[PDB]
Structures are given as C-alpha cells and as structure tokens.
Amino acid sequence: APVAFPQDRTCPYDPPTAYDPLREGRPLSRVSLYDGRSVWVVTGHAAARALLSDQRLSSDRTLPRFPATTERFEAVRTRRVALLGVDDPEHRTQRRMLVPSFTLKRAAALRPRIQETVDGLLDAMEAQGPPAELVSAFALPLPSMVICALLGVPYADHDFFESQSRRLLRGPGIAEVQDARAQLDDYLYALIDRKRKEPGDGLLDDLIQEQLNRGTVDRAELVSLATLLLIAGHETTANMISLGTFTLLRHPEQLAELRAEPGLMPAAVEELLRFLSIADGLLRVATEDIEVAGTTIRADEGVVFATSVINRDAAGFAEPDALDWHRSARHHVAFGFGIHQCLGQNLARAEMEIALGTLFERLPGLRLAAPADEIPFKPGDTIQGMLELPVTW
C-alpha cells in the first residue's frame, strides 16, 4: 500500500513518522492522495532541485491532470492563481513587475520599521503581563502589519482579512472556501477601485499606476496577486515565528547558543527554515515526460514535493535531523527553488531574524505555558505552524 499523502505531523517541527518509508525511498516514490489517486513524491534534495527547475513541470492547477490533495482544493482549482499558479512566459512577466518591491535592499531598508513593530508588540505583551497567546499577540501581527504597509492594505481590516484567509486556506468545506474567497475578492475589488480614484502608497498602488494604467494587467489579476501576497505575506511568516519559537523552546541547548552569540541569528533562521519546512507538499504536474533518478515521470502524472523529507536528505545535509547552527543550511528548499522560488524570502528573513531574536533578547525567561504536546498546530493538508502558542516569562 503506498503511503497516503499528506498526513498530520505528530511533532510539529518533524516530518510525520508515517513518512518513514519516504525517507527510505529517496529520491522518488509514489504516494496516494485523498481520492486514492497515485502520484509521484519527490523526496531527494538533488532531484527536488532538478525538478523544480524543469519547465516540463507546470504549476497551473487548472490543467486536467493537476493533482489535488484535498476535496476543497479540487473544487477551487478551476481558477488560476496569478504568479505562483502560472507558467513562463506569463510567470516571468508577472514576477518582473513585483521583483523591485522585494529586493534584499528593500528588505534591509525595512528593518528599522520591522524592529519598531516587534518592539511595540513585545511592549504590549509586557504591559498586559504574562501569560500570552503568542500567535495572536506577536507571530501574526508582525508580518500582517508589515505586508499591509508594503501592499497598501489597511491593517485596520486585519480581523476581516485574517479571518477570511484562514477559511480560504483551511475550509473545511467547499462552501467556507467559496464564501471566504468571495468576501476577500469583493474587499479587494473595492480597494483597488478606491485606489484608482485616490492613489495611496503601496505596491498595489504601484501596480495600478505602472501596470494597469499601461494596460499591462487587469483587475482580476491584481486581486489574485493581492490575495496571494497578503496571505503568503502573513501566514508563512507567522507560522515560522510561532513554530520557530516552539522549536527553539524545545531545544534548550541550541537556544542557549543563540542567546550567547546573537550573531548566529541569520544562520539560525536559515536552519529553522530547513528543519521546519512548513510549506510541505508543493504541487506540480508533468506536461511532458521527464527522465530522472533512472525512472520516467510521464506527461500528466502528479508530482508532489515532500519539502520536509527533502530537507532531511543526508545527501543534502550532514546529520540532517539535527538542529544545528554551524553546518550550513544553504541550498534547503523550504523557500522552493527555480521558477517559483519565494519572492518574499528577503523580507521573510528580516522578519524572522528580528522577531525571534528580539523576542528571546527581551523575554529571557520565555517558556511554554502549557504542556508541549497539548499545544495545537495545523493539520497536514495545509502550511504547517502553531494555531496557538501559550507562553510565559
């Protein structure tokens, strides 16, 4: 019986034990999705990297044979997602409009603001006193506030858009997903319309001006790009901050090193990215045959990338299952690779460094406020992260 994919984690920062056979099937195995369909899983580092660079894999989920890992997804997959869900040459043209807003230089220039936002968040936690619920108090507002400012979406609407984002990603039913998407779409169409008559500051305003008013894009494409950036902007980073904190608290000795040597923080973020691999199960379909690792992925077969197992490939990383700040994590695929490699990674690094580093610098007593194995975390059919994170100090 193939391993069923995906499955819930049991320890939120490790691959599930049910993936043990995938660890031994490297670089490539087969797996069963929810409707019984059989597809390729990619489990080796070298093969992941080859394949994520191969224009013979498609990310367009509207293709007839594109794999669906949930019923919910199967239902919405008749609609394209801008950028992430588009192939070259169109992917390329979209990316180019966005890239200037997401440079390393832009990220470095935002750091003072990131630092101030984090300081204000930890200040409020400290004013209210422990315990705190770290996801809602910190891990979520930092990146939500930041992407709102960067995009020109008002953080004042965060309760609405965060709520709809959750329903959108998680459902659980088709109806929840369609309702969330409609509410978000209508919110974003109104926003864009408002911005057309009275421009603000923000990437969305730049896209309207420098793109739409050239005829280079339309409004639906903007809504799609805006949804993708708003959601990836806040969800991925919040999950990295919350799961990162949880992981660090459960590895006292690695945490103590970062405490002594804060200069390690960039390397720790990169290692936390590899070790946690929250964006697990990336989806493609072959549109032509691809020979790889001595077999052939054939046209129309589903291909799923088991990011977590890949980033624990010993060929990729010595002692891959150790959390370590000194063995390079460079070349991990937690931000993907090739064509769709994370647009927001420069920003995401600055956020995680500043947030995690300041958190532990400022609340040196920090610790879990409930038993570890009672703290809820997200299921395996979505991007991994804590749902809550009770802490004290």
Interface ranges with ligand HEM (CB under 6 A): 59, 83-84, 95, 147, 228-229, 232-233, 236-237, 240, 278-279, 282, 334-336, 340, 342-344, 347-348
Asked whether residue 342 is marked as a ligand-binding residue, the answer is yes
User: If contact means CB under 5 to 8 A according to the sort of partner, which of ligand DIF, ligand HEM, none does residue 6 touch?
Assistant: none
Residue 224 binds to ligand DIF (criterion: CB under 6 A): yes
Return the residue of 84, 285, 343, 355 that touches ligand DIF, per CB under 6 A. Answer: 84
CB of 79 to ligand DIF, least distance (A): 6
Alpha helices in 104-251 (DSSP H): 104-128, 134, 141-151, 158-170, 174-197, 203-210, 219-249
Whether residue 131 has a cis bond before it, omega within 30° of 0:
yes
Residue 255 binds to ligand DIF (criterion: CB under 6 A): no
Among residues 29 and 236, whose Cβ is nearest to ligand HEM? Answer: 236
User: If contact means CB under 5 to 8 A according to the sort of partner, which of ligand HEM, ligand DIF, none does residue 335 touch?
Assistant: ligand HEM
Crossing angle between the packed helical segments 219-249 and 345-362, to the nearest 10 degrees: 30
Residue 168 binds to ligand DIF (criterion: CB under 6 A): yes
CB of 303 to ligand DIF, least distance (A): 10
Nearest-10 Cα torsion for 222, 228, 230, 232 = -160
DSSP per-residue string spanning 236-288: HHHHHHHHHHHHHHT-HHHHHHHHH-GGGHHHHHHHHHHHH--S--EEEEESS
Return the residue of 162, 221, 235, 313 that touches ligand DIF, per CB under 6 A. Answer: 235
Residue 283 binds to ligand DIF (criterion: CB under 6 A): yes
Whether residue 27 has a cis bond before it, omega within 30° of 0:
yes
Q: Are strands 28-32 and 38-42 parallel, antiparallel or unpaired?
A: antiparallel
Among residues 16 and 85, whose Cβ is nearest to ligand HEM? Answer: 85
Asked if residue 94 lies in contact with residue 225, where contact means CB atoms within 8 angstroms, the answer is yes
Q: Are strands 38-42 and 302-305 parallel, antiparallel or unpaired?
A: parallel
Report the interface residues with ligand DIF, using CB under 6 A.
76, 79, 81, 84, 168, 181, 224, 227-228, 231-232, 235-236, 279-283, 383
Binding residues for heme: 342
Binding residues: 342
